[PDB]
Design a protein around this ligand. Sequence first.
Ligand SMILES: NC(=O)c1ccc[n+]([C@@H]2O[C@H](COP(=O)([O-])OP(=O)(O)OC[C@H]3O[C@H](n4cnc5c(N)ncnc54)[C@@H](O)[C@H]3O)[C@H](O)[C@@H]2O)c1
Ligand SMILES: NC(=O)c1ccc[n+]([C@@H]2O[C@H](COP(=O)([O-])OP(=O)(O)OC[C@H]3O[C@H](n4cnc5c(N)ncnc54)[C@@H](O)[C@H]3O)[C@H](O)[C@@H]2O)c1
Ligand SMILES: [Zn+2]
Ligand SMILES: [Zn+2]
Ligand SMILES: [Zn+2]
Ligand SMILES: [Zn+2]
Ligand SMILES: [Zn+2]
Ligand SMILES: [Zn+2]
Ligand SMILES: [Zn+2]
Ligand SMILES: [Zn+2]
Lengths: 340, 340, 340, 340
Amino acid sequence: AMMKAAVVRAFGAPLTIDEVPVPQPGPGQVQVKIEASGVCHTDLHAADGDWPVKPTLPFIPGHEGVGYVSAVGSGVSRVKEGDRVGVPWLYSACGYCEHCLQGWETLCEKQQNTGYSVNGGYGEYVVADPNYVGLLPDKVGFVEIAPILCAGVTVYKGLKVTDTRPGQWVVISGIGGLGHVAVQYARAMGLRVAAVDIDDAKLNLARRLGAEVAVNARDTDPAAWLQKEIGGAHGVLVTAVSPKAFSQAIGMVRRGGTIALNGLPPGDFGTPIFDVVLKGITIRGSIVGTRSDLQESLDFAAHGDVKATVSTAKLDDVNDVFGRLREGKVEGRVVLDFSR
Amino acid sequence: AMMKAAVVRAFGAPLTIDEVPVPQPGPGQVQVKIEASGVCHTDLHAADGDWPVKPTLPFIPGHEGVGYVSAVGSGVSRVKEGDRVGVPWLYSACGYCEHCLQGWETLCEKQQNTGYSVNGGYGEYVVADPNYVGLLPDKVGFVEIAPILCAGVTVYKGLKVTDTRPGQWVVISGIGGLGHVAVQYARAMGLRVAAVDIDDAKLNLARRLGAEVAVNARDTDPAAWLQKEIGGAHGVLVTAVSPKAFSQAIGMVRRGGTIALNGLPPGDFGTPIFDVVLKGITIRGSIVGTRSDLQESLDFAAHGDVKATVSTAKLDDVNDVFGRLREGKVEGRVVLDFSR
Amino acid sequence: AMMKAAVVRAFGAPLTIDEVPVPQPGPGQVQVKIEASGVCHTDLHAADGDWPVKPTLPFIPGHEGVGYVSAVGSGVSRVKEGDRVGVPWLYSACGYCEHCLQGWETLCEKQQNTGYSVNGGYGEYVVADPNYVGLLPDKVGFVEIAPILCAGVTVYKGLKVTDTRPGQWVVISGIGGLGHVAVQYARAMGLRVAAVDIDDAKLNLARRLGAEVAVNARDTDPAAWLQKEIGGAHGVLVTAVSPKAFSQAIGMVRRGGTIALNGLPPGDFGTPIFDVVLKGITIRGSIVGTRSDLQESLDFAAHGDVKATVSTAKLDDVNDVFGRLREGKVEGRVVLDFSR
Amino acid sequence: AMMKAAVVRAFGAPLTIDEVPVPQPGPGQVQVKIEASGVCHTDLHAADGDWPVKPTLPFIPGHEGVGYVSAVGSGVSRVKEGDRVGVPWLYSACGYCEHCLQGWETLCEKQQNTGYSVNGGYGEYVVADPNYVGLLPDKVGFVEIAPILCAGVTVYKGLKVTDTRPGQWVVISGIGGLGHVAVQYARAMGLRVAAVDIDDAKLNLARRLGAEVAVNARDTDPAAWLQKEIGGAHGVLVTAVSPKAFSQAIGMVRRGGTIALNGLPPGDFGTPIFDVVLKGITIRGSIVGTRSDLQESLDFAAHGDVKATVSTAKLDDVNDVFGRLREGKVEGRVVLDFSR
Ligand SMILES: NC(=O)c1ccc[n+]([C@@H]2O[C@H](COP(=O)([O-])OP(=O)(O)OC[C@H]3O[C@H](n4cnc5c(N)ncnc54)[C@@H](O)[C@H]3O)[C@H](O)[C@@H]2O)c1
Ligand SMILES: NC(=O)c1ccc[n+]([C@@H]2O[C@H](COP(=O)([O-])OP(=O)(O)OC[C@H]3O[C@H](n4cnc5c(N)ncnc54)[C@@H](O)[C@H]3O)[C@H](O)[C@@H]2O)c1
Ligand SMILES: [Zn+2]
Ligand SMILES: [Zn+2]
Ligand SMILES: [Zn+2]
Ligand SMILES: [Zn+2]
Ligand SMILES: [Zn+2]
Ligand SMILES: [Zn+2]
Ligand SMILES: [Zn+2]
Ligand SMILES: [Zn+2]
């Protein structure tokens, strides 16, 4: 069989929509027929090769792909034909290293990554390791659930590692794909939410989704504004694609506070070490989520606590989507629709 | 009515040994007769007034003073005349704020600091808040115990917040004033210790103190070496916080590990986003510790698990001591001896 | 000079409403004019003289008393006259023992207890230690806020130590004074709530307050019912006044689950050690709440996440109230109203 | 084709040493050649059908088998022929449930148990799940390391879940098979150890093992004595879970402390509600541990920190070994030696 897929063949170049072979599932593998496929900013980073560790060319991006198990190899019991599943960033892990045994498989040094080191969901079919796919809730459709496969799980875990508790203030910096669902997860976790971005439309989105307070960093110093407004936050989750937002976030927290980092813009960010030490601040990188994180994050969507803001696009228009996302002209998430 | 003391009357100017009034305790206060008083780099910064918030002039430095309770004001029960106590960095906290109520008095924004914002232990007597003094162990001398009020509790708390466990690997970065004490706490906390420095003398000291591994970063890349040799460290205590140490720490820590920063350097440090996020690294600021932190750290000294390298000097020679410290000629810690 | 107050002058006997002197505050003390005063089930035992350690006669019960500071002793800074305050079970703690230094003053062995070891709020005025009173929010009435002083802060802390997190199930056993507000805190902390009691009306109250499911332990074996309905809970908070309910709670959790204990019926409860060990179960006593806990719990009420179901009664009818409480004829809390 | 093995063919009856087929490994399985095989009280309960859920007959007991990997089915990468491994209590788990995904495979409700629900190590060979075998340290012999698969990991994990930290007091209740090993882990974990038993010889053993204090409960009340002498222990490990040990544990622990139960006794225990709640005490069931726990516990043995008292016996004499066990004649641990 042949299939349509969007392929990266050179960093910086537009993706090409080509006919490629349908991947077949070997032993212990499953095949997934894609019905929807979220566009993550990471996909831009990957196609631009602006990260230290590059994807091997060529490749098909996409780690927010969801659909049906359309075929099953041998020795597979976790899922069966017809099951609704998603294939996330964490494609697979070794399962027995120290990290994996501790239930921190997101840290597995032997992990594979969907739509980066292996081909992803920007296509009609994708092969997956059934041991690491998301098991989708029956009551949420493909288009709405797709973003939870990365945006959702990531910020859910990110919020967990801020070490904030119900009643406390958390700041979400960057109300994009990750950010806009981050606001919703925070409320579901009993947190009071403040939002920071550089575009009023984003802040308006945050306001609708539960943000009690919101500030535009292009209009004022957000750190100073937040210190005055709420006395500083107990936690911050940075999803912004700007190193500047990382530095600013550090000045947003109360003493003893924690800043968790999701965003992956190239380079360093300026860190006021003196204040971090004097104020006992924690800065903490968070990387997607374990299978347990993933399952829990899907359950919040299933219960209606989190609903992704989504607009659809066609596979063929993937380069336009990339352009819009790059220009910050996307509200929430774009999901590629493969439905009939 | 009068006592000798080393007084800062102008930032940068030599301290003068003056006759000044013995401070007398009012209600809820105590008086301490100093037998020994530790010196460290923080005293230089107080005397130079080169930190963001300066001491008020004139003032008596010293946050490592130890001695006997020589008099009490009314309504004191925690201690009595004749008790052996130290008057550490945390002179007092408000006791009512969110931080104080949570047992994190070190983060109190209304805290006072001994030998910085109030008069300290560079004198024959000092008035203190008995609610915040350290209660000293019987079986350890004043001179030997003094540095535990600072270096001790600092590296102890710092090691605690790396969130490591017995059997796990911790790197002690820098085996100087703080580091040589740190190696001892780590060993007593059941940690496997790797010492990193640029000086073979200090690395050999580390080995004497129980370091299982020692690597000289002048010759070899401590990060590459440790990742290979022990798979990276679960924790990293950075006692000399320089850009190189900071960045090498990020390289030495294994994924999911924690880096605790034990120093107050000037300027912003470039923090690499990609590495912190994808390695799920925690970077945590930590200096001194709470009252309970301090008592716990003293217990280690009392049981002979921790002993600071100490040399004595006279109060009258403090300027000479400051000079030696500035030039980096001080091995271990210098302690002013008030005993006849 | 004189005030009205319900006094316990001999155990097991009716309380006598008498005129007694008004207590005056000395140094470090404040006087409080009572506006409302919650009746805790604990008060029944203070008066029966029921417990291992008994109050001393004669005494005035009541540790849910709220009102205004009407007089301030010497050396008090935390509060001033006119301040809205409440006087909880934890009347005072020593402030410097190991527990107190760790922000666990509820464990202080030198603590005093309001309406037990010292006189409480079943009277027009009560003297308190200003360092341990609750600072009440302006936007909640005295009658509604009164239960938060014990019922509220207790179950809030109890829920904290179930070690449950958003999305997970918690069971509230006993939907009384503590229980009916526990359901609400649970919801505010992002938990899904199941309710257990022995009276359909109390279960219906839980449901109206946010309980998703409910079971009458008189009608079926709760535990088996809960294992079937929700697959066991992640945590349980037991406020019930029956040892039986403690034994049943143990069987209500998933493996790895935690049961927190608040209720204080006399004697032992049957514990299946074999299952507790095989299933890795945790059983944990929880004792009111620290000042931090209390302020946090008052905040939930201030924001309207929590609202006590209360009936009022006159001080003079306190014996009638006791009777009804003892018979389980009370809906939520009864609060003594001193409103002129 | 054939091998010797001890088989339970009827509950209560002597084991019969038979010649049975050597088990061959299918895909995902490995075969282990046994060199040593630990014996403990759990084997008695397996042989007696003593417990609620019984083994199926006939079966080969033994959950402490160690040896070489002698054959490797298809799709195995964790281990290879010649690898020195152990086949502990947790033969396998489902790997997909809530518990397995969270790194708590010990709580898997679909787990299989070696030498209980599947054939174990009381034979020359045994087939195992490579994903769940213990990877044995190079420097420790088969006989010495065998008990660590059981007693070792149990007491290590048990100590971990006391939530104590270095410098803090831990009580080891019972210095027998589990206890003498627990004392060693405790010291290596930096804990101050108080040993409690009723046998002076076992108490002397504890002291020589590093116990700082030892109380004989025949002659003195250990609760009152320890409360007076060390202000209660922060943690208590109950290795011999009898009602008396349980109740005394509750009296020995300091307020806020944690009691970890390491045994599987019959029947309900009377738990004092008042003491547990008022003292804020945690009671916690813990036996064996995860794969991560086992590997950590194995490292302590590899470093010389922990050594089980071991004596050997032959497979043919297992019934006699059982005899001694039953009568309580066994000091330390007995290990079957299969070596030439
Ligand atoms: N660490 C992980 O596990 C993980 C997983 C997924 C994505 N990511 C990262 O997420 C980031 C982007 O995620 P995305 O899908 O939401 O992309 P993006 O299109 O969705 O979201 C952009 C957001 O950051 C923007 N932003 C730019 N400058 C800002 C500033 N100064 N302050 C506040 N906000 C600012 C905002 O416009 C906001 O839209 C990084 O690009 C990277 O892809 C990390
Ligand atoms: N540990 C603490 O810090 C703390 C603080 C306050 C009160 N308490 C305790 O709270 C308990 C009750 O408090 P209260 O103020 O809510 O009084 P209570 O009258 O209000 O509450 C009774 C509740 O438990 C009852 N109940 C009886 N048998 C039951 C069973 N088998 N299963 C489930 N529920 C059952 C229910 O009727 C329900 O009303 C104890 O009486 C004790 O006083 C503890
Ligand atoms: Zn992504
Ligand atoms: Zn792995
Ligand atoms: Zn110092
Ligand atoms: Zn304060
Ligand atoms: Zn009460
Ligand atoms: Zn106290
Ligand atoms: Zn065993
Ligand atoms: Zn499982």
